[PDB]
Amino acid sequence: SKIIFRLLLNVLMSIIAIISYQWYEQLGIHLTVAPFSLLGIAIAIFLGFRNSASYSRFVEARNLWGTVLIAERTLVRQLRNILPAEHDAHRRIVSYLVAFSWSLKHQLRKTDPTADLRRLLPEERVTEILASSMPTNRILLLAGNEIGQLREAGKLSDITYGLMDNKLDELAHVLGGCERLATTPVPFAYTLILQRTVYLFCTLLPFALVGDLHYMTPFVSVFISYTFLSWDSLAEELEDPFATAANDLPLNAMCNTIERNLLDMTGQ
Amino acid sequence: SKIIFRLLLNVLMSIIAIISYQWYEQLGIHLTVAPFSLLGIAIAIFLGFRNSASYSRFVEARNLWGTVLIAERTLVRQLRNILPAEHDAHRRIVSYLVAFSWSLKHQLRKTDPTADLRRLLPEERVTEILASSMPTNRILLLAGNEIGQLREAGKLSDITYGLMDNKLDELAHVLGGCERLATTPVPFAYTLILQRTVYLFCTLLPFALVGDLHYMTPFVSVFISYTFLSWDSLAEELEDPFATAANDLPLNAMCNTIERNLLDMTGQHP
Amino acid sequence: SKIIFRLLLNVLMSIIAIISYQWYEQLGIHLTVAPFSLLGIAIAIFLGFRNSASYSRFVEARNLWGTVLIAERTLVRQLRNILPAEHDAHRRIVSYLVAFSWSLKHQLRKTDPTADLRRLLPEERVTEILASSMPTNRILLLAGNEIGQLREAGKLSDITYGLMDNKLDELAHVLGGCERLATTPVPFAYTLILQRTVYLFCTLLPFALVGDLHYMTPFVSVFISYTFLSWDSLAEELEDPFATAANDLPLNAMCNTIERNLLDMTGQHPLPE
Amino acid sequence: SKIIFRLLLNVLMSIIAIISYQWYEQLGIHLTVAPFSLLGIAIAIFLGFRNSASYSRFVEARNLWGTVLIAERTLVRQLRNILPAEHDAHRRIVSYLVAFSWSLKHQLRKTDPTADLRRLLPEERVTEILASSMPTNRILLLAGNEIGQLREAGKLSDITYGLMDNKLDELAHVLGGCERLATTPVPFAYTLILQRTVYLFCTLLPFALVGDLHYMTPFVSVFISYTFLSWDSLAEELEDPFATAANDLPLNAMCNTIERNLLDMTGQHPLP
Amino acid sequence: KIIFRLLLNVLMSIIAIISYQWYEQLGIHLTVAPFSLLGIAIAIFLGFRNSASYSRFVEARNLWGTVLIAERTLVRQLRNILPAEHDAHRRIVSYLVAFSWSLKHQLRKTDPTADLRRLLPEERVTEILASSMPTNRILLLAGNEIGQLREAGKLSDITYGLMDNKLDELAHVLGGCERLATTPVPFAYTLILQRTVYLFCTLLPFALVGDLHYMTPFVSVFISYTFLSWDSLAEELEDPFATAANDLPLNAMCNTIERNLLDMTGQHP
Ligand SMILES: N[C@@H](CCC(=O)O)C(=O)O
Ligand SMILES: [Cl-]
Ligand SMILES: [Cl-]
Ligand SMILES: [Cl-]
Ligand SMILES: [Cl-]
Ligand SMILES: [Cl-]
Ligand SMILES: [Cl-]
Ligand SMILES: [Cl-]
Ligand SMILES: [Cl-]
Ligand SMILES: [Cl-]
Ligand SMILES: [Cl-]
Ligand SMILES: [Cl-]
Ligand SMILES: [Zn+2]
Ligand SMILES: [Zn+2]
Ligand SMILES: [Zn+2]
Ligand SMILES: [Zn+2]
Ligand SMILES: [Zn+2]
Ligand SMILES: [Zn+2]
Ligand SMILES: [Zn+2]
Ligand SMILES: [Zn+2]
Ligand SMILES: [Zn+2]
Ligand SMILES: [Zn+2]
Ligand SMILES: [Zn+2]
Ligand SMILES: [Zn+2]
Ligand SMILES: [Zn+2]
Ligand SMILES: [Zn+2]
């Protein structure tokens, strides 16, 4: 919300344009409104499409996280329905699945998963997971071992193993999705072009408006400025949905909901 | 329609603009249409996009609900097709699937599912369901136990169990999808910014219009005001598709349809 | 075309604009182009977004019917490749799949399917289907019984059953999709808001145009009006793609195509040496 | 372009507008920019959305054809991986898969597939396929029989049969997708209505521009017309991606790509 | 490379100023209004186009994502299902890594021989370079490894099926990338817009001069920048497999894939 600084700067640019309107003819500078409508409308169209792309990206982040909840739910359900007896296996997989949620969060947030992982897994596993450059992936592999061992123990057939393997695939896609979102930002050129253009437009605007609106200039100018900046900053906040900002995803809340959901499903 | 108030208030502002037009040069105020055209078209573009995004949420909401009927239909079908004899299993599973629907509706409406659950299931189950933090997910698990037990008893093979398991996974996707839409709407910036913007534009508009239209100012002002507000409030409505507004989903109607479908003729089949 | 009444009314609205142009400022009423440019554009943006939604809905409808053909083709093909000898089963399943198509058509068209169902199926089955509150879904169940009986008999394994079952799932999605599109229209509020704004904008336009064009008003006002009315009525035809309008789906032809297709894949009287 | 006729008719309309503007006052017929500006922007928005839909259809066609390549590749891969010894089967299936591609291309183009089928299949099959009203569908069924026979011989299990059968479903989905996409006039005359709206706008525009640009009318008026006519005709092209009035290069290229690919995969190499 | 036209705009604006005094002398009028109409039209058309170009970029980024995902899970499956078959692990992983690099080369239209020799025995490198599509060949070879394990009875049809599905997924990636390479948005699009945006940008000062006088160049360059920025950004996103500044870092992505697959096989980069 550094926007209020930019709004103040606009009012200052407006009064400058008022006081210096007297010297217009003298300096030989003529500025009509029509060419600034053309520019403004274009910027609005471009901002419109840009804002759209940003929203889609935010939506995708939400979906991928939604999939974690879904896929981890059904995997646990599958475990209970196929092997209701093997509570030993349940606890191990549920922990791994809960670890995955937290590991992914920390990975995306660029924070330290050590505390959460130690809260969930034995140390032999925790140090092994943190040993991998890709810890979240390492958790999936370990979760895969449990299903694999259950198959080798003959407790799962190839079919029932396959039924569960699909859920690990689903989470692999989530990990992939999130990494792609995190590592690949919306092209820097989008923020580079638009911010330059919008800021300079808002700044130059009163100098074209002053000829027409005179004193009313500051009000009409700041209002158009507000509109364009608000739209522009919304797209900025949507672009990176894994940031810690107030407009972003409450990942902690989701990870807690996932953890509570799985522990609820095992009677813990 | 809370638009009518703002539409009426717009006519009041339009009278103010007519009577105060003479005094423009005295008060040192000049207002042309051109700047408001620029601002208006920009607001229209942004409203245009916003509304589209809202309709999307509505459409996805509707699709998620359509999947319930589809996946529930086929699961029953599969049961009727693979185990045509097991009517006791049929009835138990159906009642769960029906419970899932009503439970989901209550969840998204944040209302009490107790009445509907008792109507459908034994009390030992109603307490088990209301015990859970997520009752709808609990219902899925119970539905799952039924399919699971038919496999323990060797009535279902791994293959046919899987075929039916797939359908529960489908419902789980519906559950998660709906939660996504419900628990977190669009950003809160979207609503508070645009609503203020659209109305501040609407109130200032006559003051800029009066120069051109004079008396016809209130007419053309309320027209534009309507067009902009109509779109914003509709967008606002469709953003929460699980709410109780006019343009939202008839979830009650939908849950009936699901129920009637699953109990086709008291759950009978040749 | 009930659009042509609105164009005539536009001509008449232009004419009164021309003649009553005198008693304008004498009262004090003024109408310029720039404010109607803003409104017009706002309306054009809103129409554009709505039409987009309507087209999507039309595409989806076309897509869903597209799937019926794909799924029934493959289900018949699967029966041919897995159980090549069982032509009794073929004809039974084929007929149900044809029945499904016609039943679904009648359901969306809100017409009686008894004729078609009797043409295709024995009377016990027509009774069975019409007894259901959801007849088309009942046909799928019956189709599923055929596959299920072949599994009971051990002619199909659980795998081969599964392969065929998943095709019924496709048809189940089609049925659900179509029903959804039939009962969930583009929210009425859209069609309501746009219908009011477009009509009001078209009638007031020649009054806001007369100042600038004087006599040329009727010729310009109509051209603008027609544009907004054409684009609006395009959406109103695409939102209801199951009726018997000019823009709607030829569901009868498509049903024939499906009946033709399945009787092309079968129909080869087998065992003639 | 072939739209250079309407660009010339524009310049001719400009010259009419210049010379005749003198006799405008002696009636009281005027044309400002403001109304035609509104009309133009409105049309542009509509053209914008229409074009978007067209491009969408074009992309979907490219996807469906891309799937033929993918599915036909993986089916052949599966055959080599699961039944490496069964080359006679490899050959027959590959024949049908290549047949499917060409037969689909011909179907959508409404052109004669005889030559292409004759190069790939015995005249017995070619007659059978062309006897059917749905020849591409027939080829899929024939390819299916081949996979089915390997199963009945016990060479494929129900699982491995399933795996390959899935690929034939993909091709079936593609055939249907293409059939829908080729034979779907989503608007009846609304593609012509908007086209005529662009036509009239472009021919009335100089009469509205003359007051402001005078002689520079033809210069600006043709440029505006060019933009509108180009965008309209582009949407018209993308609308019908399988049209005889479209580009055949990509469709023929793909059929050759798939053929080259499938022969490479079975080591047969080029077919004469 | 745009700053050449940004300059040419200022020059054309100067021409517009110095030749404004000859305007009525020649009898040429240019108002802003008709250029607003044309400007907005182009802005709408650029707006949609840029949107389309983005989709291609996102799809390409998505397809490459699947490579990481599909290969990760394929290795995971090998480890979970055949934990003792480390010969198979290494061979398959080498093919998966080969596929990644070969795809990078395929799309960039470069020579894969360097990378192939680093990863595979020489007989295979020949077999691969012999094929019309080398990447497709690598998948077939990866498929042979799974197929061999099946005949040996180490994999059931079901477990073979599970692994096969991942090769199918990569085939889809191959097809997808191939489609985004070989088929750009047709010739028409760029030939229309690029010329149109240019001609508009250079003719705009002539129309702006009346209203703006000297301020012409400043306003005209501002509009021109906006229109050209958007136009060129769209062009960069259109071809996502190029080596341009705002394009997929395919070298970096292939490293990530290789590192991930090494990590999973208990090896070190
Ligand atoms: N393989 C071609 C021969 C022509 C050529 O390669 O030039 C055919 O028989 O159709
Ligand atoms: Cl437990
Ligand atoms: Cl997957
Ligand atoms: Cl438990
Ligand atoms: Cl289903
Ligand atoms: Cl029952
Ligand atoms: Cl799932
Ligand atoms: Cl007044
Ligand atoms: Cl038959
Ligand atoms: Cl061969
Ligand atoms: Cl995967
Ligand atoms: Cl390993
Ligand atoms: Zn799932
Ligand atoms: Zn347990
Ligand atoms: Zn223990
Ligand atoms: Zn630490
Ligand atoms: Zn389903
Ligand atoms: Zn029953
Ligand atoms: Zn007045
Ligand atoms: Zn299918
Ligand atoms: Zn038969
Ligand atoms: Zn595939
Ligand atoms: Zn071979
Ligand atoms: Zn002059
Ligand atoms: Zn995958
Ligand atoms: Zn190993």
Residue numbers in the entry:
A (entry chain D): 22 to 289
B (entry chain B): 22 to 291
C (entry chain A): 22 to 294
D (entry chain E): 22 to 293
E (entry chain C): 23 to 291
Quote the study on this structure.
Overall, the channel is a pentameric assembly with a single ion-conducting pathway, which varies in diameter along its length and is constrained at two narrow points: a “neck” contributed by three residues (I62/I66/F70 in KpBest and I76/F80/F84 in hBest1/cBest1) on a transmembrane helix, and an “aperture” formed by a single residue (I180 in KpBest1, I205 in hBest1, and V205 in cBest1) on a cytosolic helix. Here, by electrophysiological and structural analyses, we show that the neck and aperture in hBest1 are both indispensable Ca2+-dependent gates, and their dysregulated opening by rationally designed or patient-derived mutations causes Ca2+-independent leak and elevates Ca2+-dependent channel activity.
Alanine substitution mutants for each of the 12 residues were generated in KpBest and hBest1 and subjected to crystallography and patch clamp, respectively. Moreover, the equivalent KpBest mutants (W16A, G18A, S19A, L259A, P262A, G264A, and D269A) all showed an overall similar structure to that of WT KpBest. The corresponding “Ca2+-binding” sites in WT KpBest are occupied by Zn2+, an essential component in the crystallization buffer. In KpBest G264A, the methyl group of alanine, which is bulkier than glycine, may inhibit the binding of Zn2+. Moreover, KpBest L259A, P262A, G264A, and D269A all have relatively low resolution and slightly altered structures in this region, suggesting that the binding of Zn2+ stabilizes the channel structure.
